[PDB]
């Protein structure tokens, strides 16, 4: 996960101003899950 | 994957005689008989088949 956030404020006077934010958030989520049985029988019988 | 390989025997054996104390079956004998006494191969191939 990523939370990016910045802002910005401005003004000039003698009259403009500026007040302005943009972020970006990402998430990821893997999920593993794996199985493997083997197996063998041998039977001789006389 | 299943394999069996599976034998029961019950008569541990039979010997036969050699050939000369075998007795031939009658039809066996008969197709002997008429064998033609010469390398006509499909007489004896007949023989053979049977």
């Given at each position: 996960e990523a939370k990016h956030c910045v802002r910005i404020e401005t003004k000039k006077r003698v009259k403009k101003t500026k007040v302005e934010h943009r972020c970006t958030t990402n998430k990821l989520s893997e999920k593993h899950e794996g199985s493997f049985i083997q197996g063998a029988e041998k039977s001789i019988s006389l | 994957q299943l394999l069996v390989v599976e034998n029961t025997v019950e008569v541990a054996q039979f010997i036969n005689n050699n050939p000369e104390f075998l007795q031939l079956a009658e039809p066996f004998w008969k197709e002997l008989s008429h064998?033609?006494?010469?390398?006509d191969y499909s007489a004896y191939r007949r023989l053979i088949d049977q």
């Open positions: - | 064998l033609p006494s010469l390398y």
